[PDB]
């Protein structure tokens, strides 16, 4: 009759219940939301309250309670949950809800070794006083539950043993800003810091995990993925392997080109025993790839590339096929099959495809990427030469075999090597593109290493970022954003550290960036377009011309200010060539949208002053950054309106943006009747993109007689892709609801 319920606090222990405090907090968090029952939430969490429960559990319980009500019909639960979590996380890091003054926080963190000490060296207390005025901690209320789960799980500075969280999202953004523009002239430094801070805190620009979690801390490792090219020599094999080990140790995704390794049977090159062929080395690269992962299999991802005509291609194509002898299988690495025009033509004309070890056909491999004419010449020549070891395969058999394995595993990727060189930012004669990265989006020059510290080797890297098409109002807001994205990444290039000499060489040499989009699907839904009917062709054309034009303008503006990248002379940009001049001709037949920008002015401006960065755009997928912004992933249509994630804290649900008004506007992934629509859109985007796009093919068995996808359909989509200039093809997804 004084039946209380004693709450226990952070070693301050005992104290009576405060169910009216709780309601106030809840009531607050609900402010502005529609369709959320505070009573419902209280009911569901009060029932699990027990006498001496700690306050921290009261928060967890009320948070989950709110999170478990997330649905398509009551989507504001994601914010009610998020805000509760945000509130909890403030108290958790600061003791109050109100964040400490920025200077105080930075000071405290520097003494604790959690932030880089250079922050205080580079900025004055007065400069921190001023940044604090830019900060808006109320923006923490705009995150969705899954986004807070992500920030909390892998972005905010915390102690992973104790569990202690040390910062709040707004300090993250403001300090990312400050670190990246720390070297700017006092005159403009803080105007940039603010502009960027705004951009990222209001989700206009997304930033990769390594950057968001690291910049502001003592680390200098920000690599997402590297591209290494192996020469046909034990020295190079070794070096490649060494490089892979250093890089997976830093969590980077690996793209390996092992296409020049001579085939099994070929002669010992005085000491180098390649009698045994490619597989044994591939296996060796896989162990290297997995050297810093959990059991010897969990974590550490890579994609290995080889030409379709390599002599061991049929053995190579079935490396992930589980039914087979252990010795002839490298199942934990994806493969990238490299194809060009002539291969396809052999398929079309029902003719044969000749396999050759690269060691035996002088000039063929280089020609394959750089000059199709020459490739054809050397190819036909070597087919007739009976001295040359070769094998014949019916092109149909080879293609089907590849598509089959692609179909079953989903991880046998295609790379159109002519497309990558005839429509690229680089001169193929000097710096050709002969491979991609792990998720087939990056396309950059690489040179084999002869030792791990070889200074004449070149490794390409992933320097990324993205525009949120959902958070811009008009495409003319991209000019400001391009500036900020390009400037911040270019600074990162000089800020971060390089574990391997050949990877510094490429970054400093070409200053290559890969900026892409996220929220494409939601963007199309707001404009009432769809993916499969071709209704989004002109809008896509309009949107990617704007993205590429402003990225080049920002990079051009930057070369003016601080000088073009050292190797700008190796780009097609340097010779007055633009993406609008080399795109695949057939696109003209599926989109009439006219360029709205002065490309001719820019052409001269580039020829004259050059480009800071040699490449600027690349469309990567991005589950994590998209989640932070409550955005659909990269350019992909969503699988359904509500996506589900597992956690230790319960089931995390996230509802597609503005489901309330756009449920009928969205075209879910399995609603598309086939792939033509989408591939057309990818081809259009590819007109303007410097690198490549992680494009998927998707098939639903329900749509086919006897539930089996015809090899015909698979080849037809493959050729459709090539016909509209698609550079790469990533995953293949199969099913009808996930």
């Amino acid at each position: 009759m004084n039946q209380n319920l004693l709450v226990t606090k952070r070693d301050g222990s005992t104290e009576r219940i405060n169910l009216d405090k709780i309601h106030r907090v809840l009531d607050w968090a609900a402010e502005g939301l529609h369709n959320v029952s505070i009573s419902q939430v209280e009911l569901r969490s009060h029932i699990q309250f027990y006498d001496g429960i700690k306050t921290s559990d009261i928060h967890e319980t009320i948070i989950k309670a709110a999170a478990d009500l997330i649905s398509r019909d009551a989507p504001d639960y994601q914010y009610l949950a998020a805000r509760l979590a945000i509130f909890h996380l403030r108290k958790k890091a600061y003791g109050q809800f109100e964040p400490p003054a920025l200077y105080d926080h930075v000071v405290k963190m520097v003494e604790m070794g959690k932030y880089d000490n250079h922050l205080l060296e580079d900025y004055t207390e007065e400069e921190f006083k001023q940044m604090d005025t830019f900060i808006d901690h109320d923006r923490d209320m705009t995150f969705s539950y899954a986004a807070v789960k992500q920030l909390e799980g892998k972005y905010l500075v915390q102690n992973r043993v104790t569990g202690e969280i040390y910062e709040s999202a707004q300090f993250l953004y403001i300090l990312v800003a400050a670190c990246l523009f720390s070297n700017y002239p006092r005159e403009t430094r803080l105007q940039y810091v603010k502009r960027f801070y705004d951009a990222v805190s209001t989700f206009k620009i997304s930033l990769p995990t390594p950057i968001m979690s690291g910049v502001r801390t003592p680390t200098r490792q920000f690599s997402s993925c590297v591209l290494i090219e192996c020469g046909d020599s034990l020295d190079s094999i070794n070096a490649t392997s060494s490089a892979i080990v250093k890089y997976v140790s830093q969590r980077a995704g690996i793209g390996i080109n092992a296409g020049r390794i001579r085939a099994l049977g070929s002669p010992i090159r005085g000491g180098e025993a390649f009698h045994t062929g490619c597989i044994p080395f591939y296996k060796h690269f896989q162990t290297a790839v997995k050297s810093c992962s959990q059991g010897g299999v969990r974590g550490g991802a890579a994609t290995l590339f080889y030409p379709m005509w390599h002599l061991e291609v049929e053995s190579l194509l079935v490396l992930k096929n589980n039914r087979g002898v252990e010795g002839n299988r490298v199942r934990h690495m994806d493969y990238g099959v490299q194809i060009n025009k002539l291969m396809y033509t052999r398929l079309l004309k029902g003719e044969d495809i000749t396999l050759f070890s690269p060691s035996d056909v002088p000039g063929l491999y280089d020609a394959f990427f750089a000059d199709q004419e020459e490739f054809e010449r050397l190819y036909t020549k070597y087919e007739k030469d009976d001295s040359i070891r070769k094998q014949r395969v019916k092109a149909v058999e080879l293609f089907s075999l590849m598509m089959q394995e692609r179909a079953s595993t989903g991880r046998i990727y295609i790379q159109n090597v002519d497309h990558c060189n005839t429509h690229s930012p680089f001169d193929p004669a000097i710096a050709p593109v002969r491979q991609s990265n792990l998720c087939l989006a990056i396309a950059l020059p690489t040179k084999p290493l002869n030792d791990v510290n070889d200074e004449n080797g070149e490794i390409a890297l992933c320097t990324l970022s993205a525009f949120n098409l959902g958070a811009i109002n008009n495409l003319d807001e991209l000019e400001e954003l391009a500036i900020l994205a390009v400037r911040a990444l270019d600074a990162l290039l000089d800020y971060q550290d390089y574990p391997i000499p050949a990877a510094k060489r490429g970054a400093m040499g070409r200053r290559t960036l890969g900026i892409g989009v996220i929220n494409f699907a939601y963007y199309l839904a707001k404009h009432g377009k769809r993916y499969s009917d071709g209704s989004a062709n002109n809008l896509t054309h309009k949107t990617f011309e704007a993205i590429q034009y402003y990225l080049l303008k920002a990079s051009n503006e930057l070369a003016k200010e601080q000088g073009a990248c050292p190797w700008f002379n190796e780009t097609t940009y340097a010779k007055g060539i633009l993406p609008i001049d080399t795109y695949k001709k057939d696109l003209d037949t599926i989109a009439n949208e006219p360029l709205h920008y002065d490309w001719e002015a820019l052409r001269e401006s580039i020829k004259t002053h050059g480009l800071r960065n040699s490449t600027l755009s690349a469309l990567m997928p991005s589950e994590t950054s998209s989640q932070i912004s409550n955005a659909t992933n990269g350019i992909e249509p969503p699988r359904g309106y509500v996506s589900i994630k597992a956690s230790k804290d319960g089931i995390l649900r996230q509802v597609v943006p503005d489901y309330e008004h756009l449920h009928d506007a969205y075209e879910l992934l399995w609603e598309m009747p086939g792939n033509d629509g989408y591939l057309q859109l990818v081809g259009i985007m590819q007109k303007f993109i410097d690198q490549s796009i992680s494009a998927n093919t998707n098939y639903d068995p329900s749509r086919f007689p006897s539930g089996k996808v015809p090899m015909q359909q698979l080849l037809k989509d493959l050729l459709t892709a090539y016909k509209f200039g698609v550079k790469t093809l990533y995953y293949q997804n199969t099913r009808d609801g996930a």
Binding site: A559, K560, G563, A564, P566, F568, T608, H609, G610
Partner: peptide, 4 residues
């Protein structure tokens, strides 16, 4: 500018 363009390097030199």
């Amino acid at each position: 500018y363009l390097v030199g």
